[PDB]
Amino acid sequence: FNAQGFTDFDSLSGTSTTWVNELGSVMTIDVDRKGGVTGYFVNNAPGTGCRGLPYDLSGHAHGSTIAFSVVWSNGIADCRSATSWAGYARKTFGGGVQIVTQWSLAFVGKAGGKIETGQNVFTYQAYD
Amino acid sequence: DFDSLSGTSTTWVNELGSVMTIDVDRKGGVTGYFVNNAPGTGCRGLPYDLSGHAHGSTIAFSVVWSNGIADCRSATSWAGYARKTFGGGVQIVTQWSLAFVGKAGGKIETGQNVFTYQ
Numbered sequence: 126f127n128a129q130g131f132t133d134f135d136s137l138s139g140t141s142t143t144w145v146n147e148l149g150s151v152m153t154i155d156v157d158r159k160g161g162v163t164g165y166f167v168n169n170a171p172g173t174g175c176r177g178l179p180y181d182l183s184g185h186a187h188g189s190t191i192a193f194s195v196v197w198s199n200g201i202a203d204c205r206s207a208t209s210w211a212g213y214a215r216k217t218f219g220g221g222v223q224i225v226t227q228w229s230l231a232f233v234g235k236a237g238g239k240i241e242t243g244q245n246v247f248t249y250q251a252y253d
Numbered sequence: 254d255f256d257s258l259s260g261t262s263t264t265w266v267n268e269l270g271s272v273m274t275i276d277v278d279r280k281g282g283v284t285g286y287f288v289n290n291a292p293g294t295g296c297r298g299l300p301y302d303l304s305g306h307a308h309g310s311t312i313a314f315s316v317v318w319s320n321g322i323a324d325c326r327s328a329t330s331w332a333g334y335a336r337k338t339f340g341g342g343v344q345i346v347t348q349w350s351l352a353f354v355g356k357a358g359g360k361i362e363t364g365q366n367v368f369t370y371q
């Protein structure tokens with residue numbers, strides 16, 4: 126891959142790329158030639174659980190839009206929660222590549238079922 | 254909760270009239286399809302690929318609205334929890350985010366869906 130040659134998510138086709146959000150979480154995504162997305166999410170967000178473990182990620186990328194899902198359970202740590210992201214690609218003016226997303230985090234607390242929401246921006250990691 | 258659903262195929266319907274049929278593996282991995290019928294939306298009537306994960310009382314899944322027939326240039330992801338009510342099965346109480354790019358740029362809309370198991 127190249128951050129220079131990125132047109133939209135069709136450019137990820139048959140690639141393995143690493144993205145880091147503003148909380149320091151990292152996802153490694155394998156995008157097949159059909160826009161199928163699989164890989165791993167490592168949550169490093171301060172004051173959240175299930176940090177520094179790989180969780181299965183699955184989704185779909187097409188044109189300028191992408192959606193992916195993680196359940197916070199891997200048979201290691203279980204945070205009784207699940208997160209989904211939906212977003213769009215943006216080319217930065219410096220030649221970088223970002224996925225701007227909205228996440229929903231569902232969990233069962235003491236008061237039972239709740240849903241939190243926010244924004245993550247993932248930045249493509251060059252790794253040359 | 255969704256630990257029951259392991260190795261099963263289930264149909265769910267939300268209040269907007271959409272139907273998703275999900276296949277849950279022994280690992281909590283989810284595939285299947287989604288048929289949108291929400292008033293005011295595109296890509297109504299045809300199946301779209303669905304992927305995500307389910308474990309215990311929570312679930313997250315994603316649909317890109319392109320299937321090689323109709324392309325709405327958009328993607329939706331849902332995260333939700335099992336609510337037990339007064340029947341067999343559960344409802345999924347969800348938050349959805351819909352991403353698309355148009356004339357005011359990349360936009361992400363949000364709402365609630367409640368899916369009902371048949």
Ligand SMILES: O=C(O)CCCC[C@@H]1SC[C@@H]2NC(=O)N[C@@H]21
Nearest residue numbers: 150170173174175197204206208
């Ligand atoms: O605390 C939990 O229930 C499990 C980890 C959740 C981390 C959330 S997902 C939304 C946001 N984006 C991140 O990278 N981490 C937090």
Ligand SMILES: O=C(O)CCCC[C@@H]1SC[C@@H]2NC(=O)N[C@@H]21
Nearest residue numbers: 271289291294295318325327329
């Ligand atoms: O209009 C589009 O861009 C494609 C279809 C979007 C359907 C939305 S996804 C959120 C909401 N819940 C549904 O069941 N359908 C609508």
